[PDB]
Design a binder for this molecule. Structure first.
Ligand SMILES: [K+]
Ligand SMILES: [K+]
Ligand SMILES: [K+]
Ligand SMILES: [K+]
Ligand SMILES: [K+]
Ligand SMILES: [K+]
Ligand SMILES: [K+]
Ligand SMILES: [K+]
Ligand SMILES: [K+]
Ligand SMILES: [Mg+2]
Ligand SMILES: [Mg+2]
Ligand SMILES: [Mg+2]
Ligand SMILES: [Mg+2]
Ligand SMILES: [Mg+2]
Ligand SMILES: [Mg+2]
Ligand SMILES: [Mg+2]
Ligand SMILES: [Mg+2]
Ligand SMILES: [Mg+2]
Ligand SMILES: [Mg+2]
Ligand SMILES: [Mg+2]
Ligand SMILES: [Mg+2]
Ligand SMILES: [Mg+2]
Ligand SMILES: [Mg+2]
Ligand SMILES: [Mg+2]
Ligand SMILES: [Mg+2]
Ligand SMILES: [Mg+2]
Ligand SMILES: [Mg+2]
Ligand SMILES: [Mg+2]
Ligand SMILES: [Mg+2]
Ligand SMILES: [Mg+2]
Ligand SMILES: [Mg+2]
Ligand SMILES: [Mg+2]
Ligand SMILES: [Mg+2]
Ligand SMILES: [Mg+2]
Ligand SMILES: [Mg+2]
Ligand SMILES: [Mg+2]
Ligand SMILES: [Mg+2]
Ligand code: NA
Ligand code: NA
Ligand code: NA
Ligand code: NA
Lengths: 48, 90, 63, 77, 102
RNA sequence: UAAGGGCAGACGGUGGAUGCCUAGGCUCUCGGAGGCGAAGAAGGACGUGAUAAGCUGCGAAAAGCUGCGGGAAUCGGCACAUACGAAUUGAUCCGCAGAUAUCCGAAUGGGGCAACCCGUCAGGCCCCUGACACAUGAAUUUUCAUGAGCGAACGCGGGGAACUGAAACAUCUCAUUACCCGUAGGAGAAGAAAACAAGUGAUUCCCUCAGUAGUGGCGAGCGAACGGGGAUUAGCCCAAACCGGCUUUGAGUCGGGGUAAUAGCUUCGUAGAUAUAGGAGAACCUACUGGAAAGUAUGGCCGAAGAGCAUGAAAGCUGCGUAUCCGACAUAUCCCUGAGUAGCGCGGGACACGAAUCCUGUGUGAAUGGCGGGGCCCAUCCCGUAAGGCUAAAUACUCCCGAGAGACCGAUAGUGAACCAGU
RNA sequence: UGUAGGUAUAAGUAACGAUAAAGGGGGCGAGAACCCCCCUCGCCGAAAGACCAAGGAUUCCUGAUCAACGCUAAUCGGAUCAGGGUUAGUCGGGGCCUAAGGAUAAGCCGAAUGGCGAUCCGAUGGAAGAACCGGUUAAUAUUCCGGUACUGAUA
RNA sequence: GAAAACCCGCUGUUACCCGUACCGUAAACCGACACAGGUGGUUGGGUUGAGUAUACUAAGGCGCUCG
């Protein structure tokens, strides 16, 4: 049975990466909210 | 000072007992072969023939405190196997 | 060497001593890893002295 | 950013009001168009996006004076 | 804050199990405000064999508020103040006799 | 006979309640300050230690470098450590001023999957390196300053719901709220009568007027102003007539800076202080109990000091302190009179007001004592002088810094977080 | 059918995850059905053998340990701690080129935030210059060593 | 029944960067599990057969972590 999560690093960074968040105004809104909450990880670019 | 420390180990001892013109250094991860070569010439006054390099990432480790557990990492480094000209040692 | 002695240099012998001390510190750093030194505080001393020399050279160049 | 370059008029927000006093949001739009004008003072042709009220002001006080007044009022740019 | 005792001074224990005993200050632990007085507050420490082990007798620190500087006139464990007698330099003097402590 | 079981007591186990405790919260008061950033921010990555770094600090000069002032014996940050060194020739530590400050990020040489890849031109080394420059938009004249991004609340502006209430619901309400977006300052906005009124005299804020006048499927609801009492108190500057100079254009029309002067009535002919380190700073013995006195009992002493915290139990006289007095090498702070105007028609909006006042999408359109207002419209009367602008104070708020407080909490409480917590 | 923590009951019960299968002799050990060596047996064999990529990220090798983890025990382990280990001019990728699509220039549209719009970016495609036989580790090999070569710049 | 780059006629000194361990029809990936599932491409000996079907079996790997 195929499950919902099928990993792909290129797709992950294209969809949720730091540059894609910075591209639009609402992505920068998301980044500002996460910084205000104080999250240790800001985007999926942080994980390794 | 890109060179950090020499490599003392069984593999290095075996290769030096075999060839005797080969020496292993641990250097900064961003130093390429030309600068590793110039640096060893400066630090030891020898002529260098060839350089082989490989990048190592740090080992992941488990720091143990009184309450629980923390996840940490060691620093990354670069290995540099150095071949001197036939006739010289370190 | 001390702060007063370093400040009592001539900005050319000081530079020559700067490169000499840098090379010496690299040699001691390489040697201490192979053989653990009896008094490793010489490394801290040499590092601080290099920082002091660069500070004095920057002071002389800027003013 | 469709604004009359001579008068500064822009679209207004108001209501459609039915007979039963139902109120629905609406826009009152400017009677805006692009027109080519002969500027006599510089002997040139200039295309202006203006309203009919701006055209009335131009026909009243001349095109050069209207352009200068609009520039001093900040409408022209 | 500067302390009322220092290493190399002779002090007297004014409170505790060693009340009324004088000794020499060996080390001062400024962070926890305790000092080691020679020969006083002995403890028996059990040590495993390492660099034969055994039962070592040693000195345990005393809180500095339980120590007073000995008067160099009668040894009565006075209080001290500070003044500028020595050419204007701040020095410690005893309050019971007025003599400086050197 | 008790295989087992029931009840009680004693003693255990498990579990972590309760009591006692805590600087970790909560709510405020007073005084400051109200931004950081292209000289590269907020926030991150990667490094950096004698011994791996999880935090902290710092940046290839990397738990750190220099000078001046303070100060006097230990110090080399923390997660229960040893070594090895530094230091009275004055370390460590504190105040002020400096040096260095990798990579990403508005990111700005071009790209990019953030912390990476690839370049050009001038030099210097020597295929490879370290050090320069190389973005874009607006004033501006290619030299120059300014801007971009982030960030608590408070301000102003552009858009703008619905659940709900009306015991259904559509006018109405919720509400010019939530939310989205743009943009300032230490405050902002407003402000000097084409005003209220039936004498007062610019704005703003507080108490009243008053749940009144009004408004409203006259339902649910909404809801002033005048006047009075206070806080604070402040008024000015242009355009034109007019007088000169210059350029341009066809004696004369413009456009420039200068003078002249703007109205309920005119005009023209401060350094000492404070702050950011510091210095001094009174006065206790004996006995008892106790593991240990600060407790008890005697007996003394200080008090411009009987706040507090620590010390082997509860201390005015043990320590740090407290009352009081003293102290800074720098560095900061203190004739003319506003025209697509007034007014008007159509459709809408804001005003307490669901059609007098004010605003305008659309179409029109004057006057130069005139004009406007006093709740439909006319006349008399009264008040004012639109179509130009600026302006402190009294008012709103707290990310932050300093000093304090509580008939506020005490670890399932109090912040989600007293600890490894936005983990 | 309230919330957190702790502890019960059902109960020493269900179950211990493909019916491909095991027996014996030695070793080490305090302790062995299960660990190591040998003999015999059985299962797969267009695989349940051998490789490339995605994805994972030290699980790889060695020495200590058997607390927790492993559906039993364990002297064993993909478990804990420490040490070690990945070597390229020729392999793969990237540096070069463009597709879908994306971001933009000149311009266009639009309360704001913004939406469009041909050069640039963008592989899953095109171009890539260029070998090998033998040895060799506990763990790497077309990468290290010895022989035979090739290919591109530069003086 | 792509495009563009590109390609045609118009004797020394050298050789830079990243990956390379290990799993990978799986106990190491996606399924909370040492889970009877899912996961693109290559190779895949002998006898039998039309066959890469089927049965047996080399090389190699296993007997599926309670008896
Ligand atoms: K080589
Ligand atoms: K390599
Ligand atoms: K203002
Ligand atoms: K005192
Ligand atoms: K005491
Ligand atoms: K006291
Ligand atoms: K129920
Ligand atoms: K072993
Ligand atoms: K297989
Ligand atoms: Mg491990
Ligand atoms: Mg009990
Ligand atoms: Mg430097
Ligand atoms: Mg000093
Ligand atoms: Mg760029
Ligand atoms: Mg209703
Ligand atoms: Mg007694
Ligand atoms: Mg007690
Ligand atoms: Mg809590
Ligand atoms: Mg039930
Ligand atoms: Mg049963
Ligand atoms: Mg089951
Ligand atoms: Mg069963
Ligand atoms: Mg991978
Ligand atoms: Mg293994
Ligand atoms: Mg077990
Ligand atoms: Mg292991
Ligand atoms: Mg291209
Ligand atoms: Mg490809
Ligand atoms: Mg292998
Ligand atoms: Mg091209
Ligand atoms: Mg391999
Ligand atoms: Mg494999
Ligand atoms: Mg499986
Ligand atoms: Mg299994
Ligand atoms: Mg095939
Ligand atoms: Mg076959
Ligand atoms: Mg078959
Ligand atoms: Na019984
Ligand atoms: Na750049
Ligand atoms: Na003092
Ligand atoms: Na594979």
């Amino acid at each position: 049975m195929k499950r919902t999560y099928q990993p792909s690093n290129r797709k992950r960074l294209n969809k949720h990466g730091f540059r894609s968040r910075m591209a639009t105004a609402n992505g920068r809104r998301v980044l500002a909210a996460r910084r205000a909450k104080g999250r240790a990880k800001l985007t999926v670019s942080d994980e390794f | 000072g890109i060179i950090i420390k020499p490599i003392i180990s069984e593999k290095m001892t075996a290769v030096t007992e075999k060839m005797s013109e080969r020496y292993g250094f641990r250097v900064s991860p961003n130093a390429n072969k030309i600068e590793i070569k110039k640096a060893v010439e400066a630090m030891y006054n020898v002529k260098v023939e060839d350089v082989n390099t490989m990048r190592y990432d740090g080992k992941r480790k488990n720091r143990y405190t009184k309450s629980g557990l923390i996840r940490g990492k060691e620093a990354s480094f670069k290995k540099a196997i150095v071949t001197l000209k036939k006739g010289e040692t370190i | 060497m001390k702060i007063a002695e370093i400040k009592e240099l001539a900005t050319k012998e000081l530079q020559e001593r700067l490169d000499a001390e840098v090379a010496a510190y690299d040699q001691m750093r390489i040697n201490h890893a192979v053989s653990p030194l009896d008094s490793p505080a010489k490394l801290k001393h040499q590092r601080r002295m290099i920082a002091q020399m660069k500070t004095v050279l920057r002071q002389r160049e800027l003013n | 950013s469709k604004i009359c370059q001579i008068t500064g008029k822009k679209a207004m927000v108001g209501n459609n009001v039915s007979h039963s006093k139902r109120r629905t949001k609406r826009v009152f739009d400017v009677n805006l168009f692009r027109k080519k004008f002969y500027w006599v003072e510089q002997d040139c042709w200039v295309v202006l996006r203006i309203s009919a009220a701006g055209l009335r002001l131009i026909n009243k006080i001349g095109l050069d004076a209207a352009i200068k007044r609009a520039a001093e009022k900040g409408f022209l740019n | 804050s500067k302390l009322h005792i220092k290493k190399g001074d002779t002090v007297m224990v004014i409170s505790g199990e060693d009340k009324g005993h004088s000794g020499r200050v060996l080390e001062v632990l400024v962070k926890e405000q305790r000092a080691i007085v020679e020969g006083l507050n002995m403890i028996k420490k059990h040590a495993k064999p390492s660099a034969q082990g055994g039962i070592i007798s040693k000195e345990a620190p005393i809180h500095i508020s339980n120590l007073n500087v000995v008067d160099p006139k009668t040894g009565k464990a006075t209080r001290i103040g500070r003044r500028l007698n020595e050419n204007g330099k701040l020095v410690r003097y005893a309050k019971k006799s007025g003599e400086e402590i050197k």
